[PDB]
A = this chain, B = another copy of it.
Amino acid sequence: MKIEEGKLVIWINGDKGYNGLAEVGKKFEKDTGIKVTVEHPDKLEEKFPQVAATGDGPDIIFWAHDRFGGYAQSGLLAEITPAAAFQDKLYPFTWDAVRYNGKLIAYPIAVEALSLIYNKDLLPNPPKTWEEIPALDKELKAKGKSALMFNLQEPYFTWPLIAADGGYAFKYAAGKYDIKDVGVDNAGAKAGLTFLVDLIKNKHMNADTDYSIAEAAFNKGETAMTINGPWAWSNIDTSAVNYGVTVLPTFKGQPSKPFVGVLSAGINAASPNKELAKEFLENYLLTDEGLEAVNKDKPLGAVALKSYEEELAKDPRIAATMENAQKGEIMPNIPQMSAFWYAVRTAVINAASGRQTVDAALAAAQTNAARRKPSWRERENNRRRERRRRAVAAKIYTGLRAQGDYNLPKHCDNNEVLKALCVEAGWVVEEDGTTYR
């Protein structure tokens, strides 16, 4: 797909209220006559950087703020130019989440933080620590239930426990994130991941559990607790589960530290509709009625627009969400964040599966998250150097075959021509390559 003048195409993740956002698009079409299409393709955060480099992709992309720094360093996003008057309608810290190299590269929409979600009837008084979790699962499995199930395939859901005792992604120091100071391999992170693996070894959780499995189970009533964000509440509401949203348990006495995400809307640098996209975002979506319609579909969390957030903050689920947020940290938006997420994802999955030890899986994730990504030019330099090396050899052997008269078979490899060269120069070469004068 390419962005066409006169229409808007939006990409938002499949767990967000895309139907609600589509309704906001219809009003935009009614007031101004521009068609708005909302789509939720899988792996949209990976698809966008691929297509958008060529000028393809949607007009607007929705994702947590951590992915956008990479998008901006690749020149995939337009610079956001809201008047000062409009910026003041959004909390300053949400603008910070979409600031990169001094510039605003997206519109903040809502603040997202994981929370503990528990079945009140199946578990009154939910656990306050992670350590009492195996004990609470013994009693529950008695009733044929499980204690806790959440997504183990995306490190987002495990990071709160890894960060509890001291794990961290990139150390902040002197006003910037140090991309060489990674904390996925320290004692705190090892302790968090070990306690997770010990739950699986001791059968209190299964390592194959993904988002849908963990969802299905809590909404059906087969587990007392789950870990999820505000988007998941709407589906629980329609189930026959009486649930609450509370602080995440402590680990080794310390609070769980979820990585906080700001759902943000970036404008594709190739869109011929930047003014329309800005009009749609500033004066339709980021309004009380715009966010409400999306919010009614799947809760957004703590929205960035002050006016509608003072209404949503009355909700005790949002207060809990922000209680967990306060204990965590805003995600960095630097380009290396995708490299940190890939490394930790591989680590958690390998350790959860027994394919690697915790110490080994995290040591590799530390090296991967810190790994210097070579530039296109460096890649090109390397490619050209090996191209030159082969061609020089090819010419040497091309010439050695033409003028050599080396008593060679009709077809044979360079290794044989080299052998014949060796004997002409006064060497003997065994079959295995051992060579001496």
List the interface of chain A (C-beta within 8 A of B).
Answer: 1, 39-42, 206-208, 210, 212-213, 389, 391-396, 398-400, 403-404, 413-415, 418-419, 421-422, 424-427, 429-430, 432-437
Contact = CB atoms under 8 A, between A and B. Distances in A.
28 contacts: A1-B206, A1-B207, A1-B208, A40-B212, A41-B212, A42-B42, A389-B415, A391-B432, A391-B433, A392-B432, A392-B433, A393-B414, A393-B415, A393-B418, A395-B430, A395-B433, A396-B435, A399-B427, A399-B429, A399-B434, A399-B435, A399-B436, A400-B422, A403-B437, A404-B437, A418-B418, A421-B421, A424-B426
Contacts of A398: 435
B40 A433 contact: no
A206 B39 CA distance: 13
A39 B435 contact: no
A286 B212 CA distance: 26
B425 A213 contact: no
Contacts of A413: 389
A142 to B, nearest CB: 14
A41 B206 CA distance: 15
Given A393-B415, A418-B393, A212 B399 contact: no
Given A413-B389, A421-B421, A425-B424, A395 B435 contact: yes
Contacts of A394: 433
Contacts of A427: 399-400
A401 B378 CA distance: 30
A396 B419 contact: yes
Contacts of A418: 393, 396, 418
Closest 8 CB pairs of A and B: A395-B433, A399-B435, A392-B433, A425-B425, A1-B208, A424-B425, A396-B433, A396-B435
A427 B400 CA distance: 9
Contacts of A210: 41
Given A425-B424, A436-B403, A39 B392 contact: no
A426 B404 CA distance: 10
A398 B433 CA distance: 9
A287 to B, nearest CB: 23
Contacts of A39: 212-213
A395 B210 CA distance: 50
Nearest to A395: B433
Nearest to A423: B425
Contacts of A414: 393
Contacts of A422: 396, 400, 421
Contact of A434 (B212, B395, B432, B437): B395
Contact of A429 (B396, B424, B433): B396
Contacts of A213: 39
Contacts of A437: 403-404
B1 A393 contact: no
Contacts of A40: 212
Contacts of A429: 396, 399
Which of A206, A207, A414, A425 has the largest number of chain B CB atoms within 10 A?
A425
A430 B430 CA distance: 29
A146 B393 CA distance: 60
Contacts of A395: 430, 432-435
Contacts of A403: 435-437
Contacts of A41: 210, 212
A433 B206 contact: no
Contacts of A393: 414-415, 418, 433
A206 B392 CA distance: 49
